[PDB]
């Protein structure tokens, strides 16, 4: 049989992959690139097999011919008697988060404020809020809307990267990988927690997972949920308990993609790997846990319960949904 070559984005994901590889007896091995788009190109070249992707990146990958294989499934809100691998996915809630103490601020007063995004091209961090903003403003100049932002993957000299902070050395300011302090869900929430920005575009789970002692990380360990508010599109502000009535969109879950001719094999191997190292896996926490990374969401989100099988052998557009695809395509006309 053949080995599965995973693609790690940046050096923190590489280290985790290398641990997985050792534990897997080289059933999985590792390629690494500096950005998600570069890992997508390694897969298109056949130099890696697969990686797990946010839906905005699935859009890129799917325009290039890669296909969805298995999706992240977090814990369901409702009792289900189905095994995790067979439970339908629920989608996550993209939200706009602000500090409660920043009292004037609503969706309708974002212009000229400071923003924190997960990365350019990602769902909650970029496609949904900027797609909404370009539409409501009637303008493609999304790069001149906020006074300053951290939007990993934008031009590092531009206002969209001005709040980014890079690594322990200021190296790699604004790169779209975990070496940027403000990258991803937890990075963009930290940018708001620290008052670097006025608003963060993340998902509902990020706010709960990084407050009220749910994270022991230094920057998060003392944050309280009640000190944050969600911006609803009708101009109101709500406590973070009200995400089901105050969100920007429901996003498709992150999912693994591969080339079509490797998808079946990638799927079989991941199903076995999560049986060893997944949540309650045979050898997690003893040896290695595929869905943990000290809150840093490396390779997978730390809140992944399993990777689940997809219904209907979906194309990428069927997985993302026609509404979302159409929103992305509308926004990409601006660039």
């Amino acid at each position: 049989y053949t080995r599965v070559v995973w693609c790690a984005v940046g050096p923190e994901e590489q280290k985790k992959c290398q641990q997985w590889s050792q534990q897997s007896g080289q059933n999985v091995t590792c390629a690494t690139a500096s950005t998600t788009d570069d890992c997508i190109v390694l897969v298109l070249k056949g130099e890696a097999d697969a990686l797990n992707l946010d839906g905005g990146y699935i859009y890129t990958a799917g325009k290039c011919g890669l296909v969805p294989v298995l999706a992240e499934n977090r814990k369901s809100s409702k009792h289900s008697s189905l095994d995790c691998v067979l439970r339908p996915t629920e989608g996550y809630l993209a939200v706009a988060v602000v500090k409660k103490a920043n009292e004037g601020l609503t969706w309708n007063s974002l212009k000229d404020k400071k923003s924190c995004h997960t990365a350019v091209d990602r769902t909650a961090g970029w496609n949904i809020p900027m797609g909404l903003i370009v539409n409501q403003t009637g303008s493609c100049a999304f790069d001149e809307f906020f006074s300053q932002s951290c939007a990993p993957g934008a031009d590092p000299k531009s206002r969209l990267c001005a709040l980014c902070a890079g690594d322990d050395q200021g190296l790699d300011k604004c790169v779209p990988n975990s070496k940027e302090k403000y990258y991803g869900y937890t990075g963009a929430f930290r940018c708001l927690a620290e008052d670097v920005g006025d608003v963060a575009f993340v998902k509902n789970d990020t706010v709960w997972e990084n407050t009220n002692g749910e994270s022991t990380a230094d920057w998060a360990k003392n944050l309280k949920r009640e000190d944050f508010r969600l911006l609803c599109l009708d101009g109101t502000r709500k406590p973070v308990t009200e995400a089901q009535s105050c969100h920007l969109a429901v996003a498709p879950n992150h999912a693994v993609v591969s080339r079509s001719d490797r998808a079946a094999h990638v799927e079989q191997v991941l199903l076995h790997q999560q049986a060893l190292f997944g949540k309650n896996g045979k050898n997690c926490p003893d040896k290695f846990c595929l869905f943990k990374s000290e809150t840093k969401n490396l390779l997978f989100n730390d809140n992944t319960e399993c990777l689940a099988k997809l219904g209907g052998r979906p194309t990428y557009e069927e997985y993302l949904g026609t509404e979302y695809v159409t929103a992305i395509a509308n926004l990409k006309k601006c660039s």
């Binding site: 788009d37 997508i40 190109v41 298109l44 890129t60 325009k63 290039c64 011919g65 395509a329 990409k332």
Partner: peptide, 6 residues
């Protein structure tokens, strides 16, 4: 809306 970015 049609081609690969790379």
């Amino acid at each position: 809306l049609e081609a690969c970015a790379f």
